Copies of this chain bind each other. A is one copy, B any other.
């Protein structure tokens, strides 16, 4: 079976003081046997985070570029991430897609480069509200994953995150059933476009709004393998989410 995966995306939040406290809280928490825990601190703090965090928890970067070195001021490479002791990178997040307008082609190139360099990838997909209301969720998510799939050689270091963009700051919450329906179709796509083994072993995590209160019902869905957590990553609520499957 698939190891339960819990990622905490800190986004653009925190200073050395309040993050050190957050880290002390996590260091105390007991991590269940079959649970994989990953934190993604702001880029300035990757180094700081890895030095203070217990080796039991992984560190991810929130983004990177697609070559190993070069004239791209303000960017960082997978090699730099590895160099700081991080092992994962989040690629293709909704915020890079829809705020900063990163293209599918570019996300794919980033995926292939980060994997070639030994990093794990959390690859984000999902549809916006205008597209859900038109009835084209399926078309939009599959097209996204084809572009990722076309660039993955070895699926053992890949995690797919579904982000229901249509239900973030819209005043429109997604039900557990609605998450489940999309996770099932994604797994089905992997089954018929890649292979059975890849479909059965690849973890698909839900990156929608999750709280200490909602997490239990979402984690009991058959095709939900864990979480990519936004705002709750910064509170002790995170420790409850880590224990969601018990």
Interface residues of chain A, those whose CB is within 8 Å of chain B, are: 9, 11-16, 40, 42-48, 61-63, 65, 69-77, 79-81, 83-84, 90, 93, 95-96, 99-101, 230
A62: B residues at CB distance < 8 A: 73-74
Beta-carbon contact of A95 and B73 below 8 Å = yes
Beta-carbon contact of B43 and A83 below 8 Å = no
In the complex, which of the residues A48, A71, A73, A90 has the most CB atoms of chain B within 10 Å of its own CB atom?
A: A73
Q: How far is the CB of A63 from chain B (nearest CB, A)?
A: 3
Beta-carbon contact of A96 and B73 below 8 Å = yes
A9: B residues at CB distance < 8 A: 73
A72's contact among B44, B48, B83, B95, by CB below 8 Å, is which?
A: B95
Q: How far is the CB of A80 from chain B (nearest CB, A)?
A: 5
Knowing A44-B46, A46-B44, A47-B45 touch, does A74 contact B63 (C-beta < 8 A)?
yes
Beta-carbon contact of A83 and B11 below 8 Å = no
Beta-carbon contact of A12 and B75 below 8 Å = yes
Beta-carbon contact of A72 and B11 below 8 Å = yes
In whole angstroms, what is the CA distance A70 to B12 when docked?
Answer: 5
A96: B residues at CB distance < 8 A: 73-74
Beta-carbon contact of A11 and B44 below 8 Å = no
Q: How far is the CB of A206 from chain B (nearest CB, A)?
A: 17
Beta-carbon contact of A74 and B230 below 8 Å = no
A101: B residues at CB distance < 8 A: 101
In whole angstroms, what is the CA distance A83 to B75 when docked?
Answer: 20
Query: Contacts A11-B72, A12-B76 given; 5 further ones with Cβ under 8 A?
Result: A43-B44, A44-B46, A44-B47, A47-B48, A73-B95
Beta-carbon contact of B93 and A74 below 8 Å = yes
Beta-carbon contact of A76 and B44 below 8 Å = yes
Beta-carbon contact of A44 and B81 below 8 Å = yes
A77: B residues at CB distance < 8 A: 12
A12: B residues at CB distance < 8 A: 65, 69-73, 75-77, 80
